[PDB]
Amino acid sequence: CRQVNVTQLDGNENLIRDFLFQNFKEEGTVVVGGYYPTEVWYNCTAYAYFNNIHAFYFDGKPLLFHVHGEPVSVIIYISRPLLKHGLVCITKTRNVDYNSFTSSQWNSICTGNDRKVPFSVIPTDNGTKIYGLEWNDELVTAYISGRSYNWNINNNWFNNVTLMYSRSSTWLHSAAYVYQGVSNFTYY
C-alpha cells in the first residue's frame, strides 16, 4: 500500500547484508542469484494480497499470513507455551475464517486434523534479522534469525499469500511490521 526504504529504519540497517552473506563465508567476490529481497519494502479485519511471488519476507505486535496450496496450506500467526510467540498451522482444509482464527482462544485454534507447531520468535535480536519463507513443489525453506530450516513436502503451491495487517483486539492493534514478496530472479 505504501512504500518504505527498509534500510532506513531503526535496527534494520544491516538486516539485508546479514542475509546475503549467510552462506558466503569466504574471501573474494561473487555474484549470486535468487529470490533475494530488495531495498523498497511495503509498510501498510483488513487484508492484503500478493500474487505470483516465489518468496515472502518480513521484518508483541501480531501478524498473520496464509500461504495457499493444494492439498496442504500454511498459516503463520505471530502473537500458549512461555516465550512462544509464533505458531505454524499446516491446514489440510481449504478456506478458513481469519477472524474466528484470531478471536478464539489459543487453546483451540489449529485443532482437528491440522498440524500445530508453536515456535519461538527470538526476542533478543531486537528485530534486526530477516524472517522469511521460500517454497517450491519439493522443498520449503524457513529463515528465522540467522539459520535456515528445510521441510520436504510434496505440494502444489499457488504462489500467492493472504496477509492480515489490521484487526480489533491475542491481537494488539498496531502497525510495526514490514513485508515484501519476491517474484523475480534478482542478482547481488
Ligand SMILES: *[C@@H]1O[C@H](CO)[C@@H](O[C@@H]2O[C@H](CO)[C@@H](O)[C@H](O)[C@H]2NC(C)=O)[C@H](O)[C@H]1NC(C)=O
Ligand atoms: C491463488 O492462486 C490460485 C491459483 O490460481 C487461485 O485459485 C484459483 O482462483 C481462481 C480465481 O482467481 C478460480 O477461478 C480458480 O478456480 C481457483 N483454482 C483453484 C485450484 O482453487 C486462488 O484464488 C488465489 N488466491 C488468492 C488469495 O489470490
Ligand SMILES: *[C@@H]1O[C@H](CO)[C@@H](O)[C@H](O)[C@H]1NC(C)=O
Ligand atoms: C529511499 O531513499 C531515497 C534517498 O536515499 C529517496 O529518494 C527515496 O524516495 C526513498 N524511497 C522510499 C521512501 O520509498
Ligand SMILES: *[C@@H]1O[C@H](CO)[C@@H](O)[C@H](O)[C@H]1NC(C)=O
Ligand atoms: C538488543 O537490545 C538489548 C537492549 O538494548 C541489548 O542489550 C542487546 O545486546 C541487543 N542485542 C543485539 C544488538 O544483538
Ligand SMILES: *[C@@H]1O[C@H](CO)[C@@H](O)[C@H](O)[C@H]1NC(C)=O
Ligand atoms: C508504518 O507506517 C505507519 C503509518 O505511517 C507507522 O505508524 C508505522 O510506525 C510504520 N511502521 C514501521 C515498522 O516503521
Ligand SMILES: *[C@@H]1O[C@H](CO)[C@@H](O)[C@H](O)[C@H]1NC(C)=O
Ligand atoms: C519482473 O521482471 C520483469 C522483467 O523481467 C518485469 O517486467 C516485471 O515487472 C518484474 N516483476 C515485478 C513484480 O517486479
